[PDB]
Amino acid sequence: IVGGYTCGANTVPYQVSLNSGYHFCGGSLINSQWVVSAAHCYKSGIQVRLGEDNINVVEGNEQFISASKSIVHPSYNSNTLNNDIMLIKLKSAASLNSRVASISLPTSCASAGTQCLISGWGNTKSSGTSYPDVLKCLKAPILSDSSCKSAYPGQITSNMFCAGYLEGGKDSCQGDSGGPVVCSGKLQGIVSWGSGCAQKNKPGVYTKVCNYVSWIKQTIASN
Ligand SMILES: [Ca+2]
């Protein structure tokens, strides 16, 4: 997150770190056995880290559970990142409590202007690189479709939206994707891609989760 603020420990109880000997992607717990992330974060050897704040120190509240199955949406396209969504089943269920909680899936899509919170342990710098120890937060609004498509003409499908700061300075970045965009207590987006960060007139592009609720529930009911 470029231009964000320290969240505060365990204030975003649904946020997970995907780990393979270091942090590389975010995710969201949507029930005790399933995590929603980005299809682009897929790799084998994923360990899901729950209840985290300082990703480099064991502080209490953490649950480390291995991924059992990662189910990349079958129409994921890595060149366009269309349908950038992935389901991870936990090898074992998490203990839900105040610090480890699931986030609701939406029943309707959200409108332009809705404010949302985006979080992650990704890069903090637009130029260069600096990875935080603790979880960063950013309040950002969903932008209109027209503003999104004129910023990335030809690259925005119906499964994407642009949340942020056309001014620059505030945006999500590398290592944040796979993580949550929560608006009014509903997981509305997954951090997916953008042109640099916190780049002026290049807002962040996000997977539109409301388009995927039936698929998540059917895929979860059969696995
Ligand atoms: Ca830790």
Q: Answer yes or no: do 187 and 94 share one domain.
A: no
* Whether 216 and 177 share a structural domain: no
Q: Is 117 strand, coil or helix? A: strand
DSSP state of 152: S
For residues 192 and 222, state if they share a domain.
no
130-167 CB burial, b ≥16 within 10 A, e <16: ebbebbbbbebbbbeeeebeebbeeebeebbbbbbbee
Instruction: Report the amino acid identity of residue 186.
Output: K
Same domain (yes/no): 111, 1: yes
Resolution in A: 2.2
Number of domains present in the structure of the chain: 2
So which residues are the catalytic ones?
40, 84, 177
Task: Judge whether 118 and 181 are in contact, CB under 8 Å.
Answer: yes
Binding residues for Ca(2+): 52, 54, 57, 62
Q: How many CB atoms lie within 10 A of CB 217?
A: 11
Alpha-carbon distance of 180 to 143, in angstroms, equals: 17
Whether residue 90 is found in the same domain as residue 142: no
Q: Where are the beta strands (DSSP E) in 91-146?
A: 115-120, 136-141
Query: Which residues are annotated binding-site positions?
Result: 52, 54, 57, 62, 171-172, 174-175, 177
Q: Which residue type does 77 have?
A: N
Judgement on whether residues 86 and 156 belong to the same structural domain of the protein: no
**Where is 149: in which H helix or E strand?**
helix 145-151
Place of tokens 């985006």: 118
Give me the domain span that covers residue 220: 13-102+211-223
Say which CATH number the domain at 199 has.
2.40.10.10
Quick one: residue 164, left, alpha or beta (phi over 0 = left, psi -120 to 50 = alpha)? left
Interior/surface letters 22-51, b for 16+ CB within 10 angstroms, e for the rest: ebbbbbbbbeebbbbbbbbbbeeebebbbb
User: How far is it, in rounded angstroms, from Cα 159 to Cα 130?
Assistant: 30
Q: Kindly state whether residues 44 and 141 are assigned to the same domain.
A: no
- Give the span between the Cα atoms of 109 and 52, in whole angstroms: 29
**What Å distances lie between residue 84 and 10, 30, 79, 176, CA to CA?**
26, 17, 11, 14
Measured distance CA(63)–CA(91) in Å, rounded? 12
Query: Are residue 62 and residue 112 in the same domain, yes or no?
Result: no
DSSP secondary structure letter of residue 104: B
183: closest CA among 88, 101, 120, 104?
A: 104
Is 90 in the same domain as 129?
no
**Are residues 95 and 112 both part of a single domain?**
no
Question: Within this chain, do residues 7 and 112 fall inside the same structural domain, yes or no?
Answer: yes
Instruction: Based on the fold, state whether residues 134 and 215 are members of the same structural domain.
Output: no
Task: Supply 88's token pair.
Answer: 């991870």
Question: In which residue are the tokens 């499964």 written?
Answer: 159
Q: How far is the CA of 20 from the centre of ligand 1 (A)?
A: 14
The phi-psi region of residue 159 (left if phi > 0; otherwise alpha if psi is between -120 and 50; otherwise beta) is: alpha
> What's the CA-to-centroid distance between 76 and ligand 1, angstroms?
32
CB contact set of 24 (below 8 Å; sequence gap of 6+): 18, 41, 43, 175
